[PDB]
Coordinates of all heavy atoms in Angstrom, one line a residue:
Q1 N 3.3 57.4 179.3 CA 3.8 56.1 179.7 C 5.4 56.1 179.5 O 5.8 56.6 178.5 CB 3.1 55.0 178.9 CG 3.7 53.6 179.2 CD 3.9 53.2 180.6 OE1 3.2 53.8 181.5 NE2 4.6 52.1 180.9
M2 N 6.0 55.7 180.6 CA 7.5 55.6 180.5 C 7.9 54.1 180.6 O 7.4 53.3 181.4 CB 8.1 56.3 181.7 CG 9.6 56.3 181.8 SD 10.3 56.9 180.3 CE 9.7 58.6 180.3
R3 N 8.8 53.7 179.6 CA 9.2 52.3 179.5 C 10.8 52.3 179.8 O 11.4 53.4 179.6 CB 8.9 51.7 178.3
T4 N 11.3 51.1 180.1 CA 12.7 51.0 180.2 C 13.5 50.7 178.9 O 13.0 49.9 178.1 CB 13.0 49.8 181.2 OG1 12.3 49.9 182.5 CG2 14.5 49.6 181.5
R5 N 14.5 51.4 178.7 CA 15.3 51.4 177.5 C 16.5 50.4 177.6 O 16.8 49.6 176.7 CB 15.8 52.7 177.1
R6 N 17.2 50.4 178.8 CA 18.3 49.6 178.9 C 18.5 49.4 180.5 O 18.1 50.3 181.2 CB 19.5 50.1 178.2
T7 N 19.3 48.4 180.8 CA 19.6 48.1 182.2 C 21.1 47.8 182.3 O 21.6 46.9 181.6 CB 18.8 47.0 182.8 OG1 17.5 47.2 182.8 CG2 19.3 46.6 184.2
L8 N 21.8 48.5 183.1 CA 23.3 48.4 183.3 C 23.6 47.5 184.4 O 23.2 47.8 185.5 CB 23.9 49.8 183.5 CG 23.6 50.8 182.4 CD1 24.3 52.2 182.7 CD2 23.8 50.5 181.0
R9 N 24.2 46.3 184.2 CA 24.5 45.4 185.2 C 26.0 45.1 185.1 O 26.6 45.1 184.0 CB 23.6 44.1 185.1 CG 23.8 43.2 186.3 CD 23.6 43.9 187.6 NE 23.8 43.0 188.7 CZ 23.8 43.4 189.9 NH1 23.6 44.6 190.3 NH2 24.0 42.6 190.9
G10 N 26.6 44.8 186.2 CA 28.1 44.5 186.3 C 28.8 45.1 187.4 O 30.0 45.2 187.5
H11 N 28.0 45.8 188.3 CA 28.5 46.5 189.5 C 27.9 46.0 190.7 O 26.7 45.6 190.8 CB 28.3 48.0 189.3 CG 29.2 48.8 190.2 ND1 30.6 48.9 189.9 CD2 29.0 49.6 191.3 CE1 31.1 49.8 190.8 NE2 30.1 50.1 191.6
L12 N 28.7 45.9 191.8 CA 28.2 45.4 193.1 C 28.1 46.4 194.2 O 27.3 46.2 195.1 CB 29.1 44.3 193.6 CG 30.5 44.7 194.3 CD1 31.1 43.6 195.0 CD2 31.4 45.2 193.2
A13 N 28.8 47.5 194.0 CA 28.8 48.6 195.0 C 27.4 49.4 194.9 O 26.8 49.2 193.9 CB 30.0 49.5 195.0
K14 N 27.2 50.3 195.8 CA 26.0 51.1 195.9 C 26.1 52.3 195.0 O 27.3 53.0 195.0 CB 25.6 51.6 197.3 CG 24.3 52.4 197.4 CD 24.0 52.7 198.9 CE 23.9 51.5 199.7 NZ 23.6 51.7 201.2
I15 N 25.2 52.6 194.1 CA 25.2 53.7 193.2 C 24.6 54.9 193.9 O 23.3 54.9 194.1 CB 24.5 53.3 191.9 CG1 25.2 52.2 191.2 CG2 24.5 54.5 190.9 CD1 26.7 52.3 191.1
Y16 N 25.4 55.9 194.1 CA 24.9 57.1 194.8 C 24.6 58.2 193.7 O 23.5 58.7 193.6 CB 25.9 57.7 195.8 CG 25.7 57.1 197.1 CD1 26.5 56.0 197.6 CD2 24.8 57.6 198.0 CE1 26.3 55.4 198.9 CE2 24.5 57.0 199.3 CZ 25.3 56.0 199.7 OH 25.1 55.4 201.0
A17 N 25.6 58.6 193.0 CA 25.5 59.7 192.0 C 25.6 59.1 190.6 O 26.3 58.2 190.3 CB 26.6 60.8 192.2
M18 N 24.8 59.8 189.7 CA 24.9 59.4 188.3 C 24.9 60.6 187.5 O 23.9 61.2 187.1 CB 23.6 58.5 188.0
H19 N 26.1 61.2 187.2 CA 26.3 62.4 186.4 C 26.3 62.1 185.0 O 27.1 61.3 184.4 CB 27.6 63.0 186.9
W20 N 25.4 62.7 184.2 CA 25.3 62.5 182.8 C 26.1 63.7 182.1 O 26.0 64.8 182.5 CB 23.8 62.6 182.2 CG 23.7 61.9 180.9 CD1 23.9 62.5 179.7 CD2 23.2 60.7 180.7 NE1 23.6 61.7 178.7 CE2 23.1 60.5 179.3 CE3 22.8 59.6 181.4 CZ2 22.6 59.3 178.7 CZ3 22.3 58.5 180.9 CH2 22.3 58.3 179.5
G21 N 26.8 63.3 181.0 CA 27.7 64.2 180.3 C 26.9 65.1 179.4 O 25.7 64.8 179.1
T22 N 27.4 66.2 179.0 CA 26.9 67.2 178.1 C 26.9 66.7 176.6 O 26.2 67.4 175.8 CB 27.6 68.6 178.1 OG1 29.1 68.3 178.1 CG2 27.2 69.2 179.4
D23 N 27.4 65.6 176.3 CA 27.4 64.9 174.9 C 26.4 63.9 174.7 O 26.3 63.4 173.6 CB 28.8 64.5 174.6 CG 29.3 63.5 175.6 OD1 28.6 63.2 176.7 OD2 30.4 62.9 175.4
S24 N 25.7 63.6 175.7 CA 24.5 62.5 175.6 C 25.1 61.2 175.2 O 24.4 60.4 174.6 CB 23.4 63.0 174.7 OG 22.2 62.3 174.9
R25 N 26.3 61.0 175.5 CA 27.0 59.7 175.1 C 27.5 58.9 176.3 O 27.3 57.7 176.4 CB 28.2 60.1 174.2 CG 28.9 58.8 173.6 CD 27.9 57.9 173.0 NE 27.5 56.8 173.7 CZ 26.8 55.7 173.2 NH1 26.3 55.7 172.0 NH2 26.5 54.7 174.1
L26 N 28.2 59.5 177.3 CA 28.8 58.8 178.4 C 28.2 59.4 179.7 O 27.6 60.5 179.8 CB 30.3 59.0 178.4 CG 31.1 58.0 177.6 CD1 32.6 58.2 177.7 CD2 30.8 56.6 178.0
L27 N 28.4 58.6 180.8 CA 28.0 59.0 182.1 C 28.8 58.3 183.1 O 29.3 57.2 183.0 CB 26.4 58.8 182.4 CG 26.1 57.3 182.7 CD1 24.7 57.3 183.4 CD2 25.9 56.6 181.4
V28 N 29.0 59.0 184.2 CA 29.9 58.4 185.4 C 29.0 58.2 186.6 O 27.9 58.9 186.8 CB 31.1 59.4 185.7 CG1 30.5 60.7 186.4 CG2 32.1 58.7 186.7
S29 N 29.3 57.2 187.3 CA 28.6 56.8 188.5 C 29.6 56.6 189.7 O 30.8 56.3 189.4 CB 27.7 55.6 188.3 OG 28.3 54.6 187.6
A30 N 29.1 56.7 190.9 CA 29.9 56.5 192.1 C 29.7 55.2 192.7 O 28.7 54.5 192.5 CB 29.6 57.6 193.1
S31 N 30.7 54.7 193.5 CA 30.7 53.3 194.1 C 31.0 53.5 195.5 O 31.0 54.6 196.1 CB 31.7 52.5 193.4 OG 32.9 53.1 193.3
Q32 N 31.2 52.4 196.3 CA 31.4 52.4 197.7 C 32.8 51.7 198.1 O 33.2 51.7 199.3 CB 30.3 51.7 198.5 CG 28.9 52.3 198.5 CD 29.0 53.7 199.2 OE1 29.5 54.7 198.7 NE2 28.5 53.6 200.4

């Protein structure tokens, strides 16, 4: 069973890429 841990809200553009860092701390996403 998979559950939701958190939801990131505060962006209006379309999210294409979600690159996760090698430190398991930060991640970058793309916009339009």
Side-chain angles (χ1 to χ4, degrees), residues 1-2 4 7-17 20-32:
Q1 173 52 15
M2 180 57 60
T4 302
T7 295
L8 311 181
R9 190 51 183 174
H11 200 69
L12 80 164
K14 182 178 300 179
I15 298 313
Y16 272 99
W20 200 281
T22 44
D23 53 353
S24 198
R25 184 57 259 187
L26 275 183
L27 74 160
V28 69
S29 44
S31 45
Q32 293 293 82

